[PDB]
Amino acid sequence: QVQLQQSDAELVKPGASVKISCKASGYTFTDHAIHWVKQKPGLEWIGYISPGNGDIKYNEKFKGKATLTADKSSSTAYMQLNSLTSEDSAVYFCKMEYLDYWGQGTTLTVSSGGTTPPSVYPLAPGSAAQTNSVTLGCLVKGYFPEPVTVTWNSGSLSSGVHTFPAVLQSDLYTLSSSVTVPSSTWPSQSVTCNVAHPASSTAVDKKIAPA
Amino acid sequence: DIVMTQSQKFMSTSLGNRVSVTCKASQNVGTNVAWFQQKPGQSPKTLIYSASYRYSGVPDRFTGSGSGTDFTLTINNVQSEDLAEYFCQQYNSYPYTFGGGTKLEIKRADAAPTVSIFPPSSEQLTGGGASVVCFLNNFYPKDINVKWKIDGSERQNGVLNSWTDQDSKDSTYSMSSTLTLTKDEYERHNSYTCEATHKTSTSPIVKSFNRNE
């Protein structure tokens, strides 16, 4: 049971550096190389490190950008990215050589833009709408960076949920989420969207109240 | 450096049928080609290595072929869990390089969208903005056209659209359309309509409200 655990998402300013980790466990760290890959919304190979013998190799394209190291004591591989620009915003994965074990990815956002929590607005049907089902929603407006996580009734409403990809404008993201429930359960029972934005360490709950 | 080309961005298949994805190398890469599967937000998963060898634990429904410059991934008896993006990669020489990906699409019976319209919330109006939202949910096929009409006239300025990935359970698509106005602008008109054109109806699907109500 090999596990590769990467570090959390990072938002950094242009021109800074970042050091992403990949903590390996469940095998002998010095017997396998670790490779790094970049994926921008395709995939590029960055390089590898072989902790056992210290062999490091880079894709020439990444040789003045990336620096790979490994700490044998903690079974952790590191990738430092220097002189960051928006072109470095991407998801980065580590992967064991030959074997199908990958980290979960680390999303890097390189931007000058301020971290902004979302404003969350309830979407209730108009006063004069209406059959056996009703659709409600939440407009999650004005946040940065990505992502947010949306749930309904803390997760207890799972079916009938559509959370749309966010759209970027003026350094802020907006998305919406819809949920469809039986009419016998709303408004007579509560329905609430829960919006977490990790980058600002906030979670906001908005109850959908009839209008 | 070697260019790996996947000329099909999408490939559509019914569940239970066979689909093949192609990949071309710009120069010889021998049999040092792998294939990967990737679902949204997840790492890739190895399917094939050495062009034709199945990675351990991968269903025997997956096969690979080719040598030199022309490679194919074949999936027999396609299953719902195969909905994913598929990538080839060469590792014959450094730097390793990947194809651009092919997304599978699953065929299903036509389904009409469920359309819902929402006035701006009271909360939003307090800060001076007014977003009107329309959801067009659980439809197939994926092509759909949405028009906003304000007191009868079409409006595009201020409209932002977003589309979900194909649903992994029911193979439908959903869309949101959001028309953002100022509060003053919003309050100068009455009828707001989201109108969808989809092959499931010869007549547009219309949802509306009148602000004045």
Ligand SMILES: CN(C)C(=O)c1ccccc1NC(=O)OCc1ccc(C(=O)O)cc1
């Ligand atoms: C060995 N290899 C090239 C890697 O680990 C690899 C590393 C980074 C990105 C993609 C990779 N590609 C990959 O893993 O392809 C699968 C694979 C598995 C086993 C072998 C082998 O045993 O020869 C070759 C390729």
